[PDB]
Amino acid sequence: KHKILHRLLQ
Amino acid sequence: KHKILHRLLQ
Amino acid sequence: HMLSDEQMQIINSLVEAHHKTYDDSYSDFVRFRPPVRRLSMLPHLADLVSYSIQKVIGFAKMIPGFRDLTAEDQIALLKSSAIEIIMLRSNQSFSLEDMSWSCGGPDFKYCINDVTKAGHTLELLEPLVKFQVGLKKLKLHEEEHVLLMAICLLSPDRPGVQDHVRIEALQDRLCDVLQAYIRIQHPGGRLLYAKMIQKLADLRSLNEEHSKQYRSLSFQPEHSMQLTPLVLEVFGSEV
Amino acid sequence: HMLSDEQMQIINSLVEAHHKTYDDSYSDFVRFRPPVRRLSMLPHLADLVSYSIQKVIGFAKMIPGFRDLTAEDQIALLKSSAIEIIMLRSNQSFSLEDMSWSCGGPDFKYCINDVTKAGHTLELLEPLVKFQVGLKKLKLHEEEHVLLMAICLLSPDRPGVQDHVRIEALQDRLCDVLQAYIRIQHPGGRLLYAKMIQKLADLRSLNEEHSKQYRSLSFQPEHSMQLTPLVLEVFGSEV
Known part of the structure; x- marks a missing residue:
């Protein structure tokens, strides 16, 4: 789902 | 799936 | 009588x-x-x-x-x-x-x-210390402390368990040893056994409280990314 | 001429x-x-x-x-x-x-x-050092090095990319700056630009090789458990 990445991308 | 746990349990 | x-x-x-x-x-x-x-x-x-x-x-x-x-x-x-x-x-x-x-x-x-700088509140850290103090005072022998851990780990009343009759049996045999050991080798511990089982109850509360706090933590990726694969698996609910 | x-x-x-x-x-x-x-x-x-x-x-x-x-x-x-x-x-x-x-x-x-004590073989670490040496020698300016990273990051040829026309456009504008900058501010760099683009090709090989090694690593839980949530996500294929 790329939870971390979505989050780090704002 | 508990991949780690299965593995640590031998 | 003896073991x-x-x-x-x-x-x-x-x-x-x-x-x-x-x-x-x-x-x-x-x-x-x-x-x-x-x-x-x-x-x-x-x-x-x-x-x-x-x-x-x-x-x-x-x-x-x-x-x-x-x-x-x-x-x-x-x-x-x-x-x-x-x-x-x-x-x-x-x-x-x-x-x-x-x-x-x-x-x-x-x-x-420190535990507060890790996502936990003090109103909840209080029962933990209270538990640690009570447990420390029981001045358990290594044999009783090690038995208490095995008893706890073999509780049939856990979500996801299947053969709760077999886990039930294993725990009982362990509870017997602890009971027999306390009687045979523990001077002054006539009421110790009952105190130890009460600690199991307290752990349940502490466990439930940890789940709630951990849950909030694990839904925030900026934080869960700080955990380790094994913690995410053991405390995760993908079970 | 100028920027x-x-x-x-x-x-x-x-x-x-x-x-x-x-x-x-x-x-x-x-x-x-x-x-x-x-x-x-x-x-x-x-x-x-x-x-x-x-x-x-x-x-x-x-x-x-x-x-x-x-x-x-x-x-x-x-x-x-x-x-x-x-x-x-x-x-x-x-x-x-x-x-x-x-x-x-x-x-x-x-x-x-050290990198070998991390799951990687030397026959594969060799191209990496070779790349680092070649790249170091290009004695890039901070402006060229920073541009090279942006150019690399905006390559339209990546699996999973959708608007490869828009990424294509962005990269070109960046490639233009690098080309113009090298010409205007870089004495002796008439062939530098072409050397930099060649580094992009080498990175592709290095990338593919890393995927293979990382793949083996990630299928072994005793090892993947050592990684971090973010690495597992970025290098994972759950995409």
């Missing part, structure tokens, strides 16, 4: 198992991400809890009868009791003097404060 | 972005699980690579035009180029003298050897 060659061999295995998975010098802690006093203590305690899971697993595999349960039941038992076994084994480093876990110099001395 | 007020502002942003995400003193490395020389270096390098992903992400968000792509395309670009951007930015700590990455005293001096 049987059976109960005695159970004790030997558990005490040996524990010695094999618990270093009283805490020398391995230098390999954890260093502590720091947005949750500056999370990386360190995450590594501490993760290191402990591995230890609790090694201890469990040597609990007689456990290795014979299904992989699924072993996992169900570990998942739901891991946090409790950690709280129990940590009593060994808990000092009533400073009300903290002394695992080293200044860096590895865990105070109530 | 436009546009190309110039792109450079300002990229150079500033880089400065904002790259500490030449490597002071943060003390927060990684300490290095150790079954893959004793894995916990440290995992933390190093993870720390870098976060940095590459911060740098990317400031690449003009990138924040405007879809979340999905941003992720697709980051996932497939992350390892390459790490290899590029690390040139800054690579010393041709000892053929290693000097990020500190003895503990943070990364030698070819």
Whole structure:
């Protein structure tokens, strides 16, 4: 789902 | 799936 | 009256198992991400809890009868009791003097404060210390402490468990040893056994409270990204 | 001939972005699980690579035009180029003298050897050093090095990318700046541009090789459990 990445991308 | 746990349990 | 060659061999295995998975010098802690006093203590305690899971697993595999349960039941038992076994084994480093876990110099001395820099509130850390103090006072023998951990780990009342009759049987045999041992070798412990079982109840509360706090933590990726794969798996609900 | 007020502002942003995400003193490395020389270096390098992903992400968000792509395309670009951007930015700590990455005293001096104690073979670490040496020799200006990273990160040819026409356009504008900059400000760099683009090709090979090695690593839980949530996500294929 790329939870971390979505989050780090704002 | 508990991949780690299965593995640590031998 | 006295212990049987059976109960005695159970004790030997558990005490040996524990010695094999618990270093009283805490020398391995230098390999954890260093502590720091947005949750500056999370990386360190995450590594501490993760290191402990591995230890609790090694201890469990040597609990007689456990290795014979299904992989699924072993996992169900570990998942739901891991946090409790950690709280129990940590009593060994808990000092009533400073009300903290002394695992080293200044860096590895865990105070109530630190756990707060890790996502936990003080209103909830209070029962933990209260538990540690009560447990410390019971001045358990290594045989009773090691039995208490095995009893806890084999509780049939855990979500996900299947053969709750077989886990039930294993625990009873363990509860018998603890009861017999306390009677035979523990002067002044006529009411100790009942006090120990009460600790199991307290652990349940502490466990439920941890789930709630951990849950919030795990839904925030900026924070869950700080955890370790093993913690996410054991405390995760992908079960 | 000279640079436009546009190309110039792109450079300002990229150079500033880089400065904002790259500490030449490597002071943060003390927060990684300490290095150790079954893959004793894995916990440290995992933390190093993870720390870098976060940095590459911060740098990317400031690449003009990138924040405007879809979340999905941003992720697709980051996932497939992350390892390459790490290899590029690390040139800054690579010393041709000892053929290693000097990020500190003895503990943070990364030698070819160490990466082997992390799951990688030497027959594959060889092209990496060869790449670092060639790249170091190009003696790039900070403006060229920062542009090269943005060019790499905006390659339209990455699996999972959607609007490969828009990524295509963004990269071209960046390639123009690099070309114009080299001509205007780089004495002796008439063939530099072509050498830089060749480095992009080498990174592709290095990237593909890393995927194969990383793949084996990630299928073994005793090892993947040593990685961090972010590394598992960026290098994972759950995409």
